[PDB]
Write an enzyme that holds these catalytic residues in place. Structure first.
Site, PDB file in Angstrom:
ATOM      1  N   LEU A 297       0.607  -1.068   0.214  1.00  0.00           N
ATOM      2  CA  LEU A 297       0.265   0.271  -0.365  1.00  0.00           C
ATOM      3  C   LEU A 297       0.867   1.360   0.235  1.00  0.00           C
ATOM      4  CD1 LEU A 297      -2.625  -0.647  -0.594  1.00  0.00           C
ATOM      5  CD2 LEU A 297      -2.903  -0.978   2.217  1.00  0.00           C
ATOM      6  N   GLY A 298       1.930   0.840   0.829  1.00  0.00           N
ATOM      7  CA  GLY A 298       2.602   2.254   0.587  1.00  0.00           C
ATOM      8  C   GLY A 298       3.982   1.573   1.764  1.00  0.00           C
ATOM      9  N   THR A 304       6.685  -1.123   6.300  1.00  0.00           N
ATOM     10  CA  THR A 304       5.984  -1.111   4.837  1.00  0.00           C
ATOM     11  C   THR A 304       4.766  -1.273   4.924  1.00  0.00           C
ATOM     12  OG1 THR A 304       7.029  -3.627   3.983  1.00  0.00           O
ATOM     13  CG2 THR A 304       8.319  -1.679   2.949  1.00  0.00           C
ATOM     14  N   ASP A 414       5.198  13.228  15.712  1.00  0.00           N
ATOM     15  CA  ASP A 414       5.116  12.875  14.326  1.00  0.00           C
ATOM     16  C   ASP A 414       3.910  13.007  13.541  1.00  0.00           C
ATOM     17  OD1 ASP A 414       8.534  12.445  13.526  1.00  0.00           O
ATOM     18  OD2 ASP A 414       7.806  10.770  15.343  1.00  0.00           O
TER      19      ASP A 414
HETATM   20  N1  LIG Z   1      -3.698   1.916   8.363  1.00  0.00           N
HETATM   21  C1  LIG Z   1      -3.308   2.484   7.520  1.00  0.00           C
HETATM   22  N2  LIG Z   1      -4.806   2.252   5.972  1.00  0.00           N
HETATM   23  C2  LIG Z   1      -4.507   2.536   5.239  1.00  0.00           C
HETATM   24  N3  LIG Z   1      -3.181   2.701   4.276  1.00  0.00           N
HETATM   25  C3  LIG Z   1      -2.223   2.372   5.330  1.00  0.00           C
HETATM   26  C4  LIG Z   1      -2.332   2.101   6.492  1.00  0.00           C
HETATM   27  N4  LIG Z   1      -1.096   3.149   7.140  1.00  0.00           N
HETATM   28  C5  LIG Z   1      -0.480   2.823   6.448  1.00  0.00           C
HETATM   29  N5  LIG Z   1      -0.737   3.305   5.343  1.00  0.00           N
HETATM   30  C6  LIG Z   1      -0.295   3.515   3.756  1.00  0.00           C
HETATM   31  O1  LIG Z   1       0.710   3.215   4.331  1.00  0.00           O
HETATM   32  C7  LIG Z   1       1.886   4.632   3.335  1.00  0.00           C
HETATM   33  C8  LIG Z   1       3.243   4.486   3.608  1.00  0.00           C
HETATM   34  O2  LIG Z   1       2.925   4.968   5.393  1.00  0.00           O
HETATM   35  P1  LIG Z   1       4.181   4.506   6.534  1.00  0.00           P
HETATM   36  O3  LIG Z   1       4.962   3.740   6.264  1.00  0.00           O
HETATM   37  O4  LIG Z   1       3.270   5.317   7.559  1.00  0.00           O
HETATM   38  O5  LIG Z   1       5.197   6.105   5.997  1.00  0.00           O
HETATM   39  P2  LIG Z   1       4.673   7.963   5.662  1.00  0.00           P
HETATM   40  O6  LIG Z   1       4.364   8.599   7.281  1.00  0.00           O
HETATM   41  O7  LIG Z   1       4.318   8.684   4.619  1.00  0.00           O
HETATM   42  N6  LIG Z   1       6.170   8.780   6.266  1.00  0.00           N
HETATM   43  P3  LIG Z   1       7.106   7.964   7.588  1.00  0.00           P
HETATM   44  O8  LIG Z   1       7.719   9.571   8.883  1.00  0.00           O
HETATM   45  O9  LIG Z   1       8.429   7.340   7.255  1.00  0.00           O
HETATM   46  O10 LIG Z   1       6.754   6.767   8.463  1.00  0.00           O
HETATM   47  C9  LIG Z   1       0.603   5.631   3.546  1.00  0.00           C
HETATM   48  O11 LIG Z   1       1.713   7.074   2.908  1.00  0.00           O
HETATM   49  C10 LIG Z   1      -0.202   4.890   3.559  1.00  0.00           C
HETATM   50  O12 LIG Z   1      -0.751   4.810   1.950  1.00  0.00           O
END
Ligand SMILES: Nc1ncnc2c1ncn2[C@@H]1O[C@H](COP(=O)(O)OP(=O)(O)NP(=O)(O)O)[C@@H](O)[C@H]1O
Ligand SMILES: [Mg+2]
Length: 555
Positions: A297-298, A304, A414
């Site tokens: 998803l990201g 991840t 954060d």
């Molecule tokens: N609970 C969730 N539900 C749906 N999508 C999610 C969820 N958590 C994270 N994601 C997805 O995963 C992507 C990356 O998440 P994340 O690993 O938290 O990185 P980040 O917050 O953008 N930067 P960082 O400060 O390095 O963690 C997000 O932009 C969302 O698209």
């Protein structure tokens, strides 16, 4: 009260207030007083200055006094208006001339207005079966949308609607008991949109006919046209018009999707809200009950994220799963990570991504609620059609989730738009609260750039300088997040370095007001960006200030 004041209008909208100000000429210092749209017994002052209307929230103090922005206490709204006629402490200008209610206009207060709050509360309880905090949190965020929704319910269930009673029955019901002037009922004259409005006036019953137009509109002879009996009663409770007087007290009846409302979603309430669903005995989730999808998803600094499915006693819950890096496997991090994960699992609020549990399998896994529309900054950048009112709604939900974390002694660390995930376009959830502490984030994460983002741009001065993370420093981050929201996903402090950002802040310099961002939202951002920790508000004050502005502008 303020009912004796001839320039007091009651519970009108912000746009109705502005329309009156234009009706009065829009001269500088022209003003009116009205009720705050928040059920808190407050007032609002609307002032003309430089061809614009300036609105100020007057809050009721614990002792029954009144004040604007936690400022000077005043004995009454009249005393506050008297004071601001000679000195303006923070007001755009002095107050010179009141705009009196026009002839035929009474204050928009009274029984009809009084019923609204209990009606909304009841509507949430029976549409979603919400109770306690889930119920309170639904009303706080959704009050403007809920007010619109109760206005569409069938007139038949309303206390002032008496159904198929006769003219002689209605005459007798209106006369019984204390003869309050304006005591009324509406009854059906027949099944084909014909109604009678029975009104008490000086001990006598006046029987008005309400008829349905060919256009489907309801009106009394030669009177204003309305779409519903709700709108009819609302208008007649403050504008007499054709009637000898305003409607007052209803007669007692005989007896005695990416646009969904937050509560229309599964994630609004905890999965364990169902008593049949049995909550795990600890933070640990069963790896056997979890299925991950192959596509990511990201990703981010801490891991991840993939979409997953968690098998529960009465359903398959769709979940989002953050798989921590290899660094998180270090035995030196285990105790702090498990300790923080226990505290994260305690948090239960609709406006946070609830942490359902953890899996210690092939890697460390954080099982979370799904917020499928993804991050707030990316969504806004991709959907610039999203209105300023929709943005206010989302940031206000963020302020609610942050007030809950603060009440729970939880520091996010954060708080940023990247960490605000959308369930729907009208439903935001805070993600990754306390993750950086749980994972003991390095000096290179805080100071340097990771994944194209600079984390220090969200840090309060005492965080960068003294490494002191608190609910007050989360307040600072919320101001940067508000700026991101109003800038439709733009990066803060464009092209600057952490060193450059820190030095800018020391000078008392701050980011500019985004294009189309309200003055009151830029003022809130500036309050969050208070250098001194002691003078910086907490989330309770931030949520209330945001709530007040939100309720004043939305509908
Ligand atoms: N609970 C969730 N539900 C749906 N999508 C999610 C969820 N958590 C994270 N994601 C997805 O995963 C992507 C990356 O998440 P994340 O690993 O938290 O990185 P980040 O917050 O953008 N930067 P960082 O400060 O390095 O963690 C997000 O932009 C969302 O698209
Ligand atoms: Mg995140």
């Amino acid at each position: 009260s303020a009912n004796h004041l001839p320039f007091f209008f009651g519970n009108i909208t912000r746009e109705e207030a502005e329309d009156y100000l234009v009706q009065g000429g829009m001269s500088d210092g022209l003003y009116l007083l009205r009720q705050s749209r928040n059920y808190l017994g407050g007032f609002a002052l609307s002032v003309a200055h430089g061809r614009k209307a300036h609105h100020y929230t007057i809050e009721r103090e614990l002792n029954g006094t009144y004040a604007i922005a936690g400022g000077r206490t005043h004995a009454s709204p009249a005393d506050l208006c008297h004071y601001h006629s000679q000195e303006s402490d923070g007001l755009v200008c002095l107050l010179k001339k009141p705009f009196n209610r026009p002839q035929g206009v009474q204050p928009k207060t009274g029984p009809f207005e009084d019923l609204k709050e209990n009606l909304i509360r009841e509507y949430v309880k029976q549409t979603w079966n919400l109770q306690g905090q889930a119920l309170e949190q639904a009303i706080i965020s959704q009050k403007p949308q809920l007010e619109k929704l109760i206005a569409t319910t069938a007139h038949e269930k309303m206390p002032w609607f008496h159904g198929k009673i006769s003219r002689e029955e209605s005459e007798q019901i209106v006369l019984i008991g204390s003869k309050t002037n304006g005591k009324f009922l509406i009854r059906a004259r027949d099944n084909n949109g014909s109604y009678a409005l029975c009104l008490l006036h000086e001990g006598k019953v006046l029987h008005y006919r309400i008829d349905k137009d060919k256009t489907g509109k309801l009106s009394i002879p030669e009177g204003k046209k309305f779409d519903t009996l709700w709108q009819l009663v609302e208008h007649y409770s403050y504008k007499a018009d054709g009637l000898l007087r305003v409607l007052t007290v209803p007669c007692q009846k005989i007896g005695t999707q990416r646009e969904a409302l937050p509560m229309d979603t599964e994630v609004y309430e905890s999965p364990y809200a169902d008593p049949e669903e049995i909550r795990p005995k600890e933070v640990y989730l069963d790896r056997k009950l979890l299925t991950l999808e192959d596509k990511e998803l990201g990703s981010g600094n801490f891991g991840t994220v993939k979409k997953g499915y968690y098998q529960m006693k009465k359903v398959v819950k769709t979940v989002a799963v953050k798989i921590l890096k290899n660094e998180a496997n270090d035995p030196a991090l285990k105790d702090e990570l498990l300790a923080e994960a226990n505290v994260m699992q305690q948090l239960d609020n609709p406006y946070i991504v609830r942490m359902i549990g953890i899996c210690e399998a092939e890697s460390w896994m954080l099982v979370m609620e799904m917020a499928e529309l993804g991050p707030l900054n990316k969504y806004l950048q991709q959907n610039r059609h999203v209105k300023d009112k929709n943005i206010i709604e989302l940031v206000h939900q963020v302020s609610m989730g942050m007030k809950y974390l603060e009440e729970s002694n939880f520091v996010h660390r954060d708080l940023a738009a990247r960490n605000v995930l959308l369930v729907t376009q009208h439903y935001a959830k805070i993600s990754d609260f306390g993750l950086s502490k749980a994972l003991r984030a390095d000096e290179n994460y805080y100071k340097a750039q990771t994944h194209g983002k600079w984390p220090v741009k969200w840090y309060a001065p005492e965080c960068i300088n003294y490494y002191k993370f608190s609910s007050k420093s989360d307040v600072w981050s919320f101001g940067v997040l508000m700026w991101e929201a109003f800038s439709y996903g733009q990066k803060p402090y464009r092209g600057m370095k952490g060193s450059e950002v820190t030095a800018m802040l020391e000078k008392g310099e701050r980011m500019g007001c985004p294009a189309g961002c309200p003055r009151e939202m830029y003022d809130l951002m500036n309050l969050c960006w208070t250098y001194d920790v002691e003078n910086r508000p907490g989330f309770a004050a931030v949520e209330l200030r945001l709530r007040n502005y939100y309720y004043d502008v939305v509908n």
